[PDB]
């Protein structure tokens, strides 16, 4: 019986003490998180995954273009409907406002010439949401890859089919 | 200017408070976890992902066949080397022993025939859960044997049958 030890013993020991604490037989699938203030927030495994995946950028939703990301995240049914009527976003601005946790999603729809303009004040645009949207901007082109994990910064992302830019305030 | 509110406000609130605590600008990428007794364990994002994904079954290493899973997990170089010599595992047993945190990975290699046996130590509840996901991913019939820990069983595998024998 060739005795073989696990390579990451110490790292494994941490997992054991945690997993052993989740036993109640089954695993609770829910981990408590302690913040700076000292408050425990009970989050399910799926929520912890989502929080980490968004901050790291591995979340599948962060591959979406910034506009499509906002549309999927804020349930912008009106902009889906105009897409089904032959309209496409020809230009859009995302104004991120850290104070107030808002995001102004404004732009111009065109048939391609009929043109409709839109404007949405996306509330609750927290730090997490600011990080996520920076991942969408960075995944559009390698030119914007440096703008990744940017939060608590007021900026406007201007997009056209010919140029994309981030202007700071 | 139409005002659109986020659907999951409260779920987001929890994230925000937590995310505020990781700010040092950049994020700490490390979360502090509290267990039942009241002990805090500060684990990195990568570790927490690995722990959660292992318990849920989403980890990529759990798709591997159970023997190839063990080989990769414990760095069983000897079984790779004999593989390079035209030998293949014709039969293998995995005896899970919860008391003592061991897994006996025994079996037979054939091209002459060399049999093998490994005592995989530190086979904890997390690893017992992982192995149950590999057994379940082998066939749909064995899917019920998922998330099994603290149970003494032997997994017998042949090319023509697979079985879980409980003790």
Author numbering:
A (entry chain B): 1 to 24, 34 to 121, 136 to 192
B (entry chain A): 1 to 24, 34 to 120, 137 to 192
Report text from the authors:
The phage nuclear shell is composed primarily of one protein, termed chimallin (ChmA) or phage nuclear enclosure (PhuN), which forms a single-layer-thick flexible lattice that separates the phage genome from the bacterial cytoplasm. Pores in the ChmA lattice are less than ~2 nm in width, large enough to pass metabolites but too small for passage of most proteins or messenger RNAs (mRNAs). We found that one of these proteins (gp2) associated directly with self-assembled ChmA in vitro, suggesting that it is an integral phage nuclear shell protein and prompting us to name it ChmB. We identified a key protein, ChmB, at the center of this network that is likely to have multiple roles both as a pore for macromolecular translocation through the nuclear shell and for capsid docking and genomic DNA packaging.
